[PDB]
Amino acid sequence: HHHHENLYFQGMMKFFEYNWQVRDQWFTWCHQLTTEELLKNRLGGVENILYTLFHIIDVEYSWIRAIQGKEDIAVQFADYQTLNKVKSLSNTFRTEIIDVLQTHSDQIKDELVSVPWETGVLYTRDEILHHIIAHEIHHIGQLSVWARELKLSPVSASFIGR
Template sequence: MLKFFEYNWQVRDEWFNWCNQLTAEELVKDRIGGVGSILYTLFHIVDVEHSWIRHIQGKENIDIEFTKYNTLEKVNYLSDTFRIDIADFLQTYMNQTKNELVSVPWGEEFTKDELIHHIIAHEIHHIGQLSVRARELELNPVSADFIRRKFKSVDSY
């Protein structure tokens, strides 16, 4: 499971770098489908990952407002900051409590393991949307290849 978080983080960082070639206007331009702009998609990925991890930990959700993180640099900083805490959690969580149930605000229950899988799939889904955005702009997207990547260990974040 940790490798998929490492994969998502590496790909996300590559998307942050990829975005440097775009103007601020292109980053915030509303797009059809998905959650909106390229920048908001990256913000959404970071926010949702952080929110679900806090929920799994039994912690109160922190409402992060996009208006306070509305530049590429700010979203990247938010990603890096949250990643440190998430990596620490993943080091201790993985096999110890994965079958514990978590009640979500809308009344359903899921195991922690199901939610971890959901977090991973959620980011991969939105990264696919960013690839479509790149093609619409006639630019090459970040590679989604898993097997040719070199990963750091989670404890290096």
């Protein structure tokens, strides 16, 4: 027996869909820069454009893996030093991320999740999902400043009109 998608889950998913679409637009935007430009350290967040994108991807997937209760296994930025490799990494985890989100879509939103990198700490599914959502929008906001510093128009962050 199947149930209709609950409103809470649809509202949370709209943020994910928004984030993923915006991210893809930043990947396209990054194509106009050299790998040196993409890797150049600047002030703010995790300091370079390419590592910011990697970091977003990394953190999102690490929390989704914690929700699944799988072993940590942290991908290393050293193995993803180009726009194409970071874009491929984003694609590699997407289907797993979607399946996990769908699998944890019920009304038991205070489901407890153990944090492999914090001994004796638990967060709820609800907390983690809010955190993941805010995390990407936050780092993407940082990219928009560096975009104007490079004298380039940023990708729009508007939720409406998508």
